[PDB]
Design a protein around this ligand. Structure first.
Ligand SMILES: [Cl-]
Ligand SMILES: [Cl-]
Ligand SMILES: [Cl-]
Length: 162
């Protein structure tokens, strides 16, 4: 299993604009287009991102290109982030995938807000980190996904995805 396979299972692959759980316009593999309520703006956003007139629909190949970019951005954002970096550095590999997963979904700012879980991850108190992360809006909004990512962090293994 790798970060890509991990995220594809968690986001699914959709070729036409859709609303996320939060009502936000998204496309491809969890690619946020806009928080704006307007589908018009979502379609604009979309043609600008692809560099073509899509009329709200894209190809698998275009979805993958956006994915390659979003994942790369998650990774560099962690590595440049004063708060996220020391955490990432301190972890083993599978747990590192968990943190990237979280940053891809909520952004570097969202994740930096999980102050208490970040601190226990650093301190290697797995159970405490899981319990803290579980008390979050994230958790209550997309529970199956959150449980999988949490379990990943908790255990250091890929069991939840297997
Ligand atoms: Cl927290
Ligand atoms: Cl809560
Ligand atoms: Cl879910």
């Amino acid at each position: 299993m790798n970060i890509f396979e991990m995220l594809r299972i968690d986001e699914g692959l959709r070729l036409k604009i859709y609303k996320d759980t939060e009502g936000y316009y998204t496309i491809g593999i969890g690619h946020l287009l806009t928080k704006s309520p307007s589908l018009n703006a979502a379609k604009s956003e979309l043609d600008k991102a692809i560099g073509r007139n899509c009329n709200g629909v894209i190809t698998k190949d275009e979805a993958e290109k956006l994915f390659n970019q979003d994942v790369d951005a998650a990774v560099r954002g962690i590595l440049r982030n004063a708060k996220l970096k020391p955490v990432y550095d301190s972890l083993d590999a599978v747990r590192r995938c968990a943190l990237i997963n979280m940053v891809f979904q909520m952004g570097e700012t969202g994740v930096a807000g999980f102050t208490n879980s970040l601190r226990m991850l650093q301190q290697k108190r797995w159970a405490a980190a899981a319990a803290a992360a579980a008390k979050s809006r994230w958790y209550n909004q997309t529970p199956n996904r959150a449980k999988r990512v949490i379990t990943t962090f908790r255990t250091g293994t890929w069991d939840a995805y297997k």
